[PDB]
């Protein structure tokens, strides 16, 4: 139950790196929307960034949080230098994906999947 | 037109041929190498055959 | 004599065994195992902390002179604790030799990067990180090199499916190339091409 | 031979034919359902039984290496002919 | 051994004749004129262009083209549903469903070859133990829809009946090598 | 094939067909296997 | 070679373009014709022969 | 039967040239500058 | 200074990149595969295997092929130990069912039992 | 047990047919172990690192391409140059991209 | 073995037998290993197979035209190493590398034999036994082995409701469940009752039991009758094979009352015969005398 | 049902949903989105066409292999109509023109073709028919097209009595002739609206929402025999709509009050063209008629589609008409037009 | 029949003749199949003899020939270079990778056919399809675009 750290000794500086990454993403969203001709608004993209952070927000292992921070910085750098396209950025919103309903009746009526 | 940095983004012709070769047998994975280097076909076949 | 079986020379085996003892006694701090294969190939398995000293010693030593990096590879064995085995194939042009240096890692313990030793390790470790998810410390620019932008997951891992999770198609409402969950017209038929009879008695594991 | 359904479409030699209420005949609307005119079971039915003199015959399908693997057929039953499992040729032992 | 492609052995010194030759080479474009001469020689050569579609390029009897299912001289289908063509097909472009026929013969009921997956590698025709599946040398079967390249048993049997005067002769001419 | 004619068979095509793409006699794929699961047919007589 | 090798246009396009040293090629992991162009005497067919 | 196999002739194949062959054409420099200067002077006159 | 402590279960589900439904709604089996009774060879009963639950496999309209919607259908993983398979499954966040290894029971075999004077194991044919 | 027999031997002999069947369905079993084979391709040193677990399918196949390292070295080669010099460098590294991307 | 043959002679051929439409015999492939003979002599207990002849002409099978059917008769198809004794329903259908293996449990009887279902492209193709030393060893009954083809006929695929004419017509899940739910909320406790058959799992049983208990119904009956007097289903030892199959192996006298175990539970009777052969089990029967 | 029409899969490209739909106006503007939704959810779509194979060829990627059957048809060929509707359980009618040709006019296109299609569908016994009319096409309107669409509604309801009639508002999209038309008024000097664009209320509806509503009407058991009103969330006056359109275009705004009779005269002048006309008379009074308030008719909420607003779906269709100078402008750079309750 | 429709048929024949005699491809190719494409360009088969001239930019192109495997990284770029061509544009899919995924059909980073991204007019099968079969596919495309009746459909409108 004792491991070698990656960057953060404990959870607090990992949260500090998370906060810095969120700061960079929040600053980058308006520039991304202005540069690449996105149909979305700036506030919608900030909602997207916030909810991605929220789905990742349940983890408490410092090494895993450091690796998620590193992947987020890679993703951010691919957003800074324009290597993603409009399609690559817009894949986050799942607007062409019909969402699977979570109700048991709907899952029963569609098919055999649980 | 003076160049200061070159960053070749690759993987635009990437197909996961190593994973496919892993999922197939040796004779089945033999023709993957011609399409690895489609200019050096029999050289690739020679390399794979010598390894096997 | 025998036209079917490959000829075997013992002088290469003895030379590689002597060099294995040489390297093992020079570096007892990191070297965990030294073996010579029947195919006359020398492998040294080291601690992950010893990547920098082992690679620097093999590159810069007078008797080693392994100045050329042949390749840098990861092998995913998902039954051991450190599942990613990192393999460094090196070539010595002075002594006309090839050496293999092995080490281990898992998803949460990165290993040191050898861009300061060999420059091909830059792109090789970028590929290894992109395909297996092994982080590299003190790398100049570690990022994806072969997968698509925004690709989730490392596809050369064992647990990653062959067909993947996501697939692309052109959508006409949005006039874009969109990504949707994978769905195949014909599923890849897996085959059980594993004979139930033991082929090689030399590699028989004792029963548990 | 090739037979037609009540729907009007021709039946394949394996017995496959689309129903009256299938939605999958729209793929044959303004096109044609391609079927094999020569039926293998009929063509092997027209071939006469080879009357041989030995108790065990050997078949390779003709042409030597251009045929099938060489298989041996035991012609002991006089109430039925021995059939090659590869080519379908029938053999009968001549007891006269 | 090895040889030098750009290193010169010693030096040719400086001579008035050599200097004047170098001056003529610089000023009068001598290598450009000899390149023009080689280019004009290729102009006055005879072209190597065949007259498609009225002329066709040479091939070998080993050629791998459109797939086909052959028959015996009796007319029985050669295939016996052993699925070696699937088990060796690297792209998994072959699907076989089989059942006993009305006379008990072992015959396929479904034999699909997805030619948009096929890599035209001849593994099926070299793994077939009865020479049923073959790659006939037809290559001019380009279609206008994706569906028309999804072959089934009836299409492959039609190909085998169409190209039988071709495929049997090619196997007769080539079979002693394999 | 005038001094060396090919072998004549009864199943060979007596008339050659060229490529018939974008033409009414083009090839259309279909599943050549019959139905697998046969459903239960309800009876035509009411219980009451 | 008559078309290209002695051509001054080709020589202006190719000479002193993309020069790489032997130590840099060895450290960067170059192989084949590039090491030979840099001057490193190395060939797999002559050093570790096969077939 | 004797084995028939794809074999070279027993005398071997003929010699195949592989060295580079520059024809070494053209004239000397002195004569061609002489022709040039003669053209210059004749045109001027 | 270079060695910290954590009291958790080593969850990497956010790092593997698998979508959420294929983590939460999936079940895996850890088992020694049973020997194929059409053969007597038992070399396939040596390594533990983890497989996934079977999802829907339907029929294609155009050709009748087996169309599927799950990605983890052909996924089988090989393990040297049951506890190693447990560690991998708990690390990847999949709920697991484990079947114990069915070793064949040792049996008393004697050729003289075929020819007993009084006992019932005497065989009437050879 | 490795290379398939002749077709006449297949059709006239039992064990030749058995070996043909098993080779063209399952394939030959490679004994477990790892190797690295380097062959002088015209573009450079084409290497393959093959790891076999004892089955008829390879456990791992890493494809070392010379062009991958050459394109990694493209950045140093193009210092102090222009667009035409860059396309000349791309040409003279003898780059194909199937072996690079894999 | 070797990789090339020195046999330059002609091979023998043996005429095929007709022992039944289950076990298809191509007896040229037989290598005379007597496994089927020993199985029929000891486990099947029929003594209907044997070797007729001498030397190279020795043939396995029945001398007369005899239809070989007892229970447990697909295990000769299992234990025949060559393809001489194959399965006629499985004939020419699929290949073992195609067939995906699923470890399941038999429901054809109450022994609970561990089985493998072999499925190809989303369709059940074969049933094989599994090695469980405490239940069924290496064998399954013929009904278990060859009853898989009944899952492709007379199968309910869509929900049906009675029409106003009185006929069953296809409908939607919403409509069918709405009708049944309306009748369920209409009717009270004792007016609602349920009867369970034989091929039902415990999940559905507890599901329907909970539903009927929520609608206050306790008439949760099964088709099979067990005496409810005394303890009944209260004590679990009252309705169980308490000695179990290892206890069949261990016991020395067995008294069978009112049962025909050969057809009611073929693997149970097979283990009784195994104990009778090896441990000299003393077997007695009260009931009609059956073989 | 039938065994081949039972739905399967997770609703992707390769799934089967059991919708066999003959879409008659699939080569138009709404038809491409309809066939996209059907192919995306997985359906056997029959596209009868009269234009060129290249003209329908953009539809060819919009489904899986073999899920789209293209068939030539003629509006005067009942044989072609019944061979198109022969194998279907849904028949969708999107046939319509915004002008009159020498072969087909408003009454033919909006009455005779839908009546023939509905008659062939009834003879073939298809389960479901969906017919797209227009909103506020009640009767005795100022335009010939809406009276023709009303007569077509009555004919379709007479022939196939349980037809799902969908009446959408002025549908806006990428290839529409509403927003692109208003933005292409910028090529002239001014925007000549009738009464300066006031007292004319319009509530446009997005083409993706219309197509989703059509698909949900194919798969909705409660939609049989009903008339739906596909309307947007916000009502705008015509003047404010044109002002917002030109604000997103960032071109200019010069409105002009020009009377209806002479504006219809110049609309007829533009419509007298052998090609596709820029505007017609029927176009200009269909623009200048107001859209009625949907009170009793069910809508997109009842069919399960939440109507996307024009303010959210406006920049994907007007960014073409901007110049370079205002190309990289976001949503919030333009003031949205004020909505009216009436 | 009437005189005007004969005239519009003759104008259809003229326009289709021009469009099939002048067929300029975009300089696009990805793989093995692109090597076979430039082997059609080689002097033996002579697309220049057939009237077919490479132009690098899609604006000067008529036909887009998908020669190679379409990866997930390549698909948006392919859709881009297809959309930026002018309207009289055609698509020739080349080889098994471009038709139906081919030898990488079960790959994570390969789309299963270029028809999932761009509308394909003619599929040329093979791996690689020879330059013979490629010249065949080009001639088939010429026949296809001769078969179009644009002005006749416009007149019958
Ligand atoms: C002008 C020439 C056009 C091309 C003529 C045919 C080209 C091939 C000739 C043969 C050949 O290969 O010669 C190589 C040879 C070169 O051989 P070399 O490359 O081996 O060099 C000669 C050897 N040293 C190095 C010592 C000089 O060409 C010559 O000898 C002559 C080249 C110079 C003269 C021609 C170019 C200048 C002309 C200027 C005046 C214009 C003339 C009138 C034009 C009228 C029409 C516009
Ligand atoms: C040498 C250099 C100069 C060459 C000058 C050549 C002059 C002679 C030209 C003769 C042909 C003129 C008409 C060519 C029309 C080409 C475009 C075309 O066919 O468009 C079809 C279209 C068809 O329109 P449509 O009504 O079918 O549909 C268009 C809308 N879509 C495609 C979206 C459904 O346009 C025409 O038919 C226009 C006819 C013009 C006739 C002029 C006389
Ligand atoms: N456009 C809008 O904003 C609104 C439209 N609608 C209605 O919705 C429907 C679809 O809209 P939309 O896409 O804009 O319409 P279109 O103008 O684009 O035409 C729709 C389809 O009708 C076909 N068509 C037209 N006339 C004929 C004819 N005589 N014979 C055969 N086919 C014919 C066209 O085929 P082809 O190209 O081959 O001629 C086209 O595929 C129409 O009925 C329209 O009135 C309702 C509300 C708003
Ligand atoms: C335009 C759209 C582009 C969208 C791009 C999205 C990029 C997403 C990058 C994701 C980066 C990460 O995953 S790092 C976030 C995960 N971090 C953690 O889980 C740290 C632990 N979490 C917490 O402590 C959480 O409580 C909080 C809420 C994150 C912090 O609050 P504390 O105070 O209690
Ligand atoms: S290998 Fe030949 S005989 Fe065997 S299934 Fe395939 S085509 Fe038929
Ligand atoms: S040629 Fe190769 S890829 Fe094609 S069907 Fe035969 S075995 Fe499969
Ligand atoms: S089990 Fe099979 S091989 Fe053995 S004797 Fe019986 S039939 Fe012959
Ligand atoms: S597969 Fe086995 S039993 Fe069948 S013929 Fe071959 S060797 Fe004999
Ligand atoms: S179809 Fe074959 S030749 Fe063409 S790109 Fe794919 S692998 Fe290469
Ligand atoms: K058997
Ligand atoms: Zn035969």
Chain position carrying tokens 């042949």:
C70
CA distances from C80 to F20, I99, J62, K242 (A): 59, 21, 21, 43
CA distances from D82 to D89, E158, K255, M126 (A): 8, 30, 52, 43
CA distance M106 to I73: 13
H25 lines ligand 1 (CB under 6 A): yes
Tokens encoding I83: 């506890």
H/E element, L120: helix L113-124
Q: Are J101 and B12 in contact (CB under 8 A)?
A: yes
CA distance J54 to E55: 52
Chain D residues in contact with J17 by the CB 8 A cut-off are 69
In the sheet where J60-64 sits, what is the strand order?
J33-41, J44-52, J60-64
The three-state DSSP-derived secondary structure of chain C is: CCCCCCCCCHHHHHHHHHHHHHHHHHCCCCEEEEEECCCCCEEEEECHHHHHHHHHHHHHCCCCCCCEEEEEEEEECCCCCCCEEEEEEEEECCCCEEEEEEEEECCCCCEECCCCCCCCHHHHHHHHHHHHCCCEECCCCCCCCCCCCCCCCCCCCCCCCCCCCEEEEEECCCCEEEEEECCECCCCCCCCCCCCCCCCHHHCCCCC
CA distance C49 to K56: 70
CA distance K249 to K281: 9
E83 lines ligand 5 (CB under 6 A): yes
Q: Does L36 contact C185 at a Cβ distance shorter than 8 Å? A: no
Q: Is E89 left (phi over 0), alpha (psi -120 to 50) or beta?
A: beta
**Burial class of C187 by CB neighbour count within 10 A (0 to 12, 13 to 18, 19+):** buried
CA distance C194 to D17: 39
Task: Kindly identify which residue of chain C lies nearest to residue I86, measuring between CA atoms.
Answer: C79
Q: Are L208 and L308 in contact (CB under 8 A)?
A: yes
Residues from L in contact with D at Cβ < 8 Å: 2, 4-5, 20, 44, 46, 66, 69, 71-72, 83, 86-89
Tokens encoding I126: 């050879």
CA distance L316 to A45: 17
CA distance L254 to L262: 19
A29 lines ligand 4 (CB under 6 A): yes
* Among C57, C59, C56, J89, CA closest to G23: C59
* Among L61, L25, L74, CA closest to L46: L25
Q: Are L291 and L201 in contact (CB under 8 A)?
A: yes
Q: Would you kindly state where each structural domain of chain M is located, as residue ranges?
A: 3-157
Residue C96 near chain G (CB below 8 Å): yes
CA distance E147 to E126: 27
* Among C161, J24, I61, CA closest to K95: J24
The reply to whether omega before D5 is within 30° of 0 (cis) is no
Residues having CB within 6 Å of any atom of ligand 7: K 30-36, 60, 80-82, 84-85
CA distance J39 to B47: 6
Chain position carrying tokens 């599923």:
C187
* Among D95, D96, D70, D65, CA closest to D85: D70
* Chain discontinuities in chain K, listed by preceding residue (C to N exceeding 2.5 Å): none
Ligand nearest to the CA of K82: 8
Interface residue of E116, E146, E148, E151 to substitute, partner L, most L CBs within 10 Å: E146
Among protein residues, the one with the nearest Cα to ligand 5's atom 7 is E133
Q: Are I14 and C108 in contact (CB under 8 A)?
A: no
Tell me the H-state helices in J14-97. Answer: 14-25, 66-72, 74-77, 83-92
The three-state DSSP-derived secondary structure of F2-15 is: CCCCCCCCCCCCCC
Q: Are L250 and L243 in contact (CB under 8 A)?
A: no
Residues having CB within 6 Å of any atom of ligand 8: J 18; K 29, 82-83
Distance L119 CA to ligand 3 centre (A): 20
Q: Is E55 annotated as a binding residue?
A: no
φ, ψ at I27 (rounded to 5°) = -125, 140
Tokens encoding B28: 């089945």
Q: Which residues pair with J45 in a beta bridge?
A: J40
Tell me the H-state helices in chain E. Answer: 16-27, 30-44, 84-88, 123-127, 153-162, 164-174
Shortest Cα–Cα distance, E21 to chain H (Å) = 5
Q: Is E118 annotated as a binding residue?
A: yes
CA distance L145 to E19: 92
In the DSSP assignment, the letter for residue K57 is G
Looking at ligand 3, which atom is closest to the CA of residue L104?
29
Distance of CA E22 to the CA centre of its chain: 51
Q: Does B13 contact M110 at a Cβ distance shorter than 8 Å? A: no
**Burial class of L256 by CB neighbour count within 10 A (0 to 12, 13 to 18, 19+):** middle
Tokens encoding M70: 């379409």
CA distance B9 to A36: 19
Q: Are J43 and B37 in contact (CB under 8 A)?
A: yes
Q: Are C146 and J101 in contact (CB under 8 A)?
A: yes
Write the DSSP assignment of K205-227 as a string of letters.
HHHHHHHHHHTT---EEESS---
First to last CA, chain F: 77
User: To the nearest 10°, the Cα dihedral for L269, L275, L281, L285?
Assistant: -140
Resolution of the coordinates, Å = 3.5
Ligand nearest to the CA of K23: 10
Chain B residues in contact with M31 by the CB 8 A cut-off are 13, 35, 38
Residues having CB within 6 Å of any atom of ligand 2: L 51, 55, 275-276; M 11, 15, 150-151, 153-154, 157
Query: Strands, E, within chain L: which ranges?
Result: 20-23, 44-49, 68-72, 90-93, 128-132, 164-168, 171-172, 191-193, 201-202, 205-206, 227-230, 236-237, 255-257
* Among E99, D86, J26, K249, CA closest to I39: J26
In the DSSP assignment, the letter for residue E28 is T
Q: What residues contact B28, with CB distance under 8 A and at least 6 apart?
A: E88, E90, E123, J27
Whether K contacts I, i.e. 3 or more CB pairs less than 8 A apart, is: yes
CA distance M104 to C162: 10
Residue J8 near chain D (CB below 8 Å): yes
In the DSSP assignment, the letter for residue D7 is T
Q: Collapsing DSSP states into helix, strand and coil, what is residue L126?
A: coil
CA distance L113 to L126: 17
Q: Are M87 and M119 in contact (CB under 8 A)?
A: no
CA distance A23 to I106: 67
Count of residues in chain L: 342
Q: What residues contact L155, with CB distance under 8 A and at least 6 apart?
A: L111, L114, L115, L118
CA distances from H22 to E117, G1, M80 (A): 50, 8, 49
* Among F10, E71, E69, CA closest to D46: F10
Q: What residues contact K57, with CB distance under 8 A and at least 6 apart?
A: K12
Mutating to test ligand 8, I would choose from J11, J14, J17, J18 the residue with most ligand atoms within 8 A of its C-beta, which is J18
Q: Is E89 annotated as a binding residue?
A: yes
L253 lines ligand 3 (CB under 6 A): no
Whether L contacts C, i.e. 3 or more CB pairs less than 8 A apart, is: yes
Q: What is the CATH number of domain M3-157?
A: 3.40.50.12280
CA distance I78 to J57: 14
Q: Is E79 annotated as a binding residue?
A: yes
Q: What residues contact I12, with CB distance under 8 A and at least 6 apart?
A: A64, C107, C108, I91, I92, I93
Q: Are L13 and C183 in contact (CB under 8 A)?
A: yes
The reply to whether omega before E53 is within 30° of 0 (cis) is yes
* Among M131, M42, M135, M44, CA closest to E48: M44
Q: Which residues pair with K24 in a beta bridge?
A: K86
Q: What residues contact E115, with CB distance under 8 A and at least 6 apart?
A: E66, E67, E93, E149, E150, E151, M96, M99, M125
Chain H residues in contact with G4 by the CB 8 A cut-off are none
Angle, nearest 10°, between helix axes L78-85 and L113-124? 50
Using DSSP bridges, classify how beta strands I48-52 and I76-79 pair: parallel, antiparallel or unpaired: antiparallel
Tokens encoding E134: 């073959």
Q: Would you kindly state where each structural domain of chain A is located, as residue ranges?
A: 1-114
CA distance J13 to L340: 91
């Amino acid at each position: 139950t004792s491991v070698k750290p990656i960057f953060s000794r404990d959870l607090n500086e990992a949260k500090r790196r998370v906060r810095e990454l969120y700061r960079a993403w929040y600053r980058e969203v308006p520039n991304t929307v202005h540069l690449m001709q996105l149909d979305i608004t700036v506030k919608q993209g900030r909602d997207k960034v916030r909810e991605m952070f929220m789905k990742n927000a349940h983890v408490t292992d410092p090494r895993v949080v450091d690796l998620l921070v590193i992947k987020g910085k890679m993703e951010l750098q691919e957003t800074i230098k324009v290597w993603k396209q409009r399609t690559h950025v817009m894949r986050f919103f799942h607007e062409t994906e019909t969402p699977r309903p979570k109700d048991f009746l709907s899952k029963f009526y569609m098919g055999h999947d649980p | 037109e003076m160049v200061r940095k070159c960053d070749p983004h690759i993987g635009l012709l990437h197909r996961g041929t190593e994973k496919l070769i892993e999922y197939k047998t040796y004779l089945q994975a033999l023709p993957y190498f011609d399409r690895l280097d489609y200019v050096s076909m029999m050289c690739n076949e020679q390399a794979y055959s010598i390894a096997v | 004599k025998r036209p079917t079986v490959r000829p075997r020379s013992d002088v290469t085996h003895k030379q590689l065994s002597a060099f294995g003892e040489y390297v093992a006694e020079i570096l007892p701090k990191y070297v965990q195992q030294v073996q010579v294969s029947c195919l006359d190939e020398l492998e040294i398995c080291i601690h992950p902390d010893g990547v920098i000293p082992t690679l620097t010693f093999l590159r810069d030593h007078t008797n080693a002179q392994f100045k050329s990096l042949a390749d840098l590879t990861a092998v995913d064995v998902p039954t051991r604790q450190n599942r990613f085995e990192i393999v460094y194939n090196l070539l010595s042009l002075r002594f006309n030799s090839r050496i293999r240096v092995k080490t281990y890692a898992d998803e949460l313990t990165p290993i040191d990067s050898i861009v300061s030793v060999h420059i091909a390790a830059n792109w090789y470790e970028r590929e290894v990180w992109d395909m297996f998810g092994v982080f590299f410390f003190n790398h100049p620019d570690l990022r994806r090199i072969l997968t698509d932008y925004g690709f989730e997951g490392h596809p050369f891992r064992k647990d990653f499916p062959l067909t993947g999770y996501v697939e692309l198609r052109y959508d006409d409402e949005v006039k874009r190339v969109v990504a949707e969950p994978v769905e195949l017209a014909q599923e890849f038929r897996k085959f059980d091409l594993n004979s139930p009879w033991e082929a090689f008695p030399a590699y028989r594991q004792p029963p548990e | 031979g090739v037979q037609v359904s009540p729907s009007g479409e021709k039946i394949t030699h394996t017995g496959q034919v689309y129903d009256e209420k299938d939605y999958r005949r729209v793929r044959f609307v303004d096109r044609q359902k391609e079927v094999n005119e020569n039926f293998a079971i009929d063509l092997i039915a027209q071939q006469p039984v080879n009357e041989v003199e030995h108790r065990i015959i050997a078949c390779d399908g003709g042409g030597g290496a251009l045929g099938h693997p060489k298989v041996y057929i035991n012609l002991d039953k006089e109430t039925k002919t021995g059939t090659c499992g590869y080519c379908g040729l029938q053999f009968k032992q001549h007891h006269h | 051994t090895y040889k030098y492609v750009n290193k010169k052995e010693q030096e040719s010194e400086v001579d008035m004749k050599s200097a004047t030759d170098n001056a003529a080479r610089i000023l009068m474009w001598t290598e450009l004129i000899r390149g023009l001469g080689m280019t004009l020689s290729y102009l006055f050569r005879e072209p190597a262009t065949i007259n498609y579609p009225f002329e066709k390029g040479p091939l070998s009897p080993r050629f791998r083209g459109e797939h086909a299912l052959r028959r015996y001289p009796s007319g029985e289908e050669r295939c016996i549903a052993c699925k070696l063509c699937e088990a060796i097909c690297p792209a998994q472009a072959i699907t076989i469903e089989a059942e006993p026929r009305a006379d008990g013969s072992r015959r396929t009921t479904r034999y699909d070859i997805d030619m948009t997956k096929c890599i035209y590698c001849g593994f099926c025709q070299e793994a077939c133990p009865v020479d049923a599946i073959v790659e006939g040398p037809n290559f001019e079967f380009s279609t206008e829809t994706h569906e028309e390249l999804l072959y089934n048993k009836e299409k492959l049997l039609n190909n085998g009946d169409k190209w039988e005067a071709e495929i049997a002769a090619n196997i007769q001419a080539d079979y002693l090598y394999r | 094939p005038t001094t060396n004619p090919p072998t004549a068979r009864k199943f060979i095509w007596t008339n050659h067909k060229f490529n018939v793409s974008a033409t009414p006699e083009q090839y259309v794929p279909y599943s050549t296997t019959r139905k697998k699961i046969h459903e239960w047919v309800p009876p035509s007589t009411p219980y009451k | 070679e008559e078309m290209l090798t002695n051509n001054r246009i080709w020589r202006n396009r190719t000479v002193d373009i993309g020069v790489v040293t032997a130590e840099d090629a060895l450290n960067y992991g170059f192989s084949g014709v590039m090491l030979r162009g840099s001057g490193i005497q190395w060939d797999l067919r002559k050093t570790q022969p096969y077939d | 039967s004797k084995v028939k196999q794809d074999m070279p002739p027993p005398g071997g194949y003929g010699p195949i040239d592989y060295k580079r062959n520059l024809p070494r054409r053209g004239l000397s420099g002195y004569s061609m500058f002489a022709v040039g200067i003669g053209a210059l002077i004749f045109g001027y006159w | 200074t270079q060695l910290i402590t954590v009291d958790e279960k080593l969850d990497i589900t956010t790092l593997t990149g698998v979508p959420e439904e294929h983590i939460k709604t999936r079940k895996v089996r850890i088992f020694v595969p049973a020997r194929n009774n059409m053969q007597s060879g038992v070399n396939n009963t040596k390594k533990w295997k983890m497989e996934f639950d079977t999802r829907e496999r339907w029929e294609n309209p155009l050709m009748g092929w087996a169309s599927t919607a799950d990605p983890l259908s052909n996924m089988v993983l090989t393990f040297s130990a049951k506890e190693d398979a447990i560690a991998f499954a708990e690390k990847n966040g999949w709920s697991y069912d484990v079947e114990e290894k069915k070793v064949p029971k040792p049996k008393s075999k004697s050729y003289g039992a075929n020819f007993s004077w009084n006992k019932r194991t005497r065989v009437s044919t050879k | 047990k490795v290379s398939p027999p002749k077709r006449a031997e297949m059709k006239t002999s039992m064990e030749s047919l058995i070996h043909h069947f098993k080779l063209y369905t399952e394939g030959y079993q490679v004994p477990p172990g790892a190797t690295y084979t380097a062959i002088e391709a015209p573009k450079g040193e084409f290497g393959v690192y093959l790891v076999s677990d004892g089955s008829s399918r390879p456990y791992r196949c890493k494809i070392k391409a010379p062009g991958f390292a050459h394109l990694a070295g493209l950045d140093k080669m193009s210092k102090g140059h222009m667009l035409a010099d860059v396309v000349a460098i791309i040409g003279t590294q003898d780059i194909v991209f199937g072996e690079i991307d894999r | 073995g070797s990789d090339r043959s020195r046999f330059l002679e002609g091979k023998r051929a043996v005429e095929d037998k007709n022992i039944g439409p289950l076990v298809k015999t191509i007896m040229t492939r037989c290598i005379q290993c007597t496994r089927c003979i020993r199985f029929a002599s000891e486990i099947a207990g029929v003594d209907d197979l044997g070797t007729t002849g001498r030397g190279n002409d020795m043939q396995v099978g029945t001398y007369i035209e005899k239809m070989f059917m007892s229970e447990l008769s697909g295990n000769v198809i299992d234990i025949c190493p060559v393809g001489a004794l194959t399965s006629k329903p499985y004939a020419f259908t699929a290949r073992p590398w195609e067939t995906r293996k699923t470890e399941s449990i038999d429901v054809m009887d109450a022994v609970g034999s561990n089985i493998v279902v072999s499925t190809r492209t989303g369709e059940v193709m074969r049933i094989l036994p599994r090695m469980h030393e405490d239940i069924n060893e290496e064998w399954i009954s013929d009904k278990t082995r060859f009853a898989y083809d009944g899952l492709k006929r007379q199968r309910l695929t869509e929900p049906m409701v009675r029409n106003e004419k009185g006929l069953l017509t296809y409908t939607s899940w919403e409509d069918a469940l709405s009708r049944v739910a309306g009748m369920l909320q209409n009717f009270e406790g004792n007016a609602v009752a349920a009867i369970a058959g034989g091929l039902v799992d415990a999940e559905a049983l507890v599901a329907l039991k909970d539903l009927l208990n929520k609608v206050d119904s306790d008439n949760l009956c099964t088709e099979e009758i067990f005496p409810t007097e005394g303890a009944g289903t209260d004590l679990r030892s009252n309705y169980l094979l308490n000695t179990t199959i290892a206890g069949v192996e261990e016991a020395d006298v067995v008294l069978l009352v009112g049962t025909n175990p050969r057809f009611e539970a073929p693997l149970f009777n097979a283990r009784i015969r195994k104990s009778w052969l090896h441990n000299d089990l003393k077997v007695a029967l009260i009931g009609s005398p059956v073989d | 049902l039938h065994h081949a029409v039972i739905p399967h899969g997770k609703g992707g490209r390769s799934s089967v949903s059991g919708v066999v739909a003959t879409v008659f106006g699939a080569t138009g503007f709404l038809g491409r989105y309809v066939v996209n939704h059907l192919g995306r959810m997985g359906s056997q779509v029959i596209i009868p066409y009269r234009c060129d194979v290249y003209d329908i060829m953009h539809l060819r990627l919009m489904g899986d292999l073999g899920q789209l059957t293209f068939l030539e048809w003629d509006a005067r060929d009942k044989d072609s109509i019944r061979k198109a509707v022969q194998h279907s359980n849904v028949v969708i009618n999107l046939i319509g023109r915004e002008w009159e040709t020498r072969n087909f006019d408003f009454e033919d296109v909006f009455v005779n073709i839908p009546r023939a299609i509905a008659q062939a569908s009834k003879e073939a016994g298809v389960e479901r028919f969906i017919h797209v009319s227009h909103l506020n096409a009640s009767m005795k309107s100022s335009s010939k097209s809406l009276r023709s669409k009303a007569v077509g509604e009555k004919e379709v309801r007479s022939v196939f009595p349980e037809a799902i009639i969908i009446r959408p508002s002025d549908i806006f999209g990428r290839e529409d002739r509403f927003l692109n038309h208003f933005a292409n008024y910028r090529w002239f000097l001014a925007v000549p609206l009738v009464s300066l664009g006031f007292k004319t209320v319009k509530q446009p509806v997005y083409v993706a929402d219309v197509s989703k509503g059509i698909v949900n009407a194919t798969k909705d058991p409660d939609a049989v025999g009903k008339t739906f009103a596909f309307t947007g969330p916000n009502r705008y006056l015509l003047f404010h709509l044109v002002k917002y359109i030109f604000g997103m275009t960032h071109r200019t705004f010069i409105p002009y009050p020009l009377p209806l009779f002479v504006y219809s005269w110049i609309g007829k002048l533009f419509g007298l063209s052998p090609f596709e006309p820029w505007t017609t008379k029927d176009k200009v009074e269909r623009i200048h008629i107001s859209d009625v308030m949907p009170t009793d008719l069910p809508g997109l909420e009842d069919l399960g589609v939440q109507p996307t607003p024009l303010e959210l779906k406006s920049i994907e269709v007007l960014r073409r008409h901007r110049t370079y100078r205002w190309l990289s402008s976001e949503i919030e750079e333009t003031k949205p037009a004020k909505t009216v309750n009436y | 029949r009437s005189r005007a429709e004969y005239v519009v048929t003759k104008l259809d024949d003229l326009i289709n003749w021009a469009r099939r005699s002048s067929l300029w491809p975009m300089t696009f190719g990805l793989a093995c199949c692109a090597v076979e494409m430039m082997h059609m360009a080689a002097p033996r088969y002579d697309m220049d003899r057939f009237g077919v001239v490479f132009r690098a930019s899609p604006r000067q192109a008529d036909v887009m020939i998908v020669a190679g495997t379409l990866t997930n990284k390549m698909a948006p770029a392919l859709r881009k270079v297809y959309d930026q061509m002018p309207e009289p544009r055609y698509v020739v899919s080349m080889g098994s990778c471009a038709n139906g995924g081919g030898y990488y059909h079960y790959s994570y980073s390969v789309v299963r056919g270029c028809d999932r991204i761009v509308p394909v007019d003619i599929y040329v099968p093979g791996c690689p399809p020879t330059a013979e079969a490629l010249l065949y596919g080009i001639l088939q495309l010429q026949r296809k675009i001769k078969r179009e009746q644009k002005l006749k459909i416009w007149y019958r409108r």
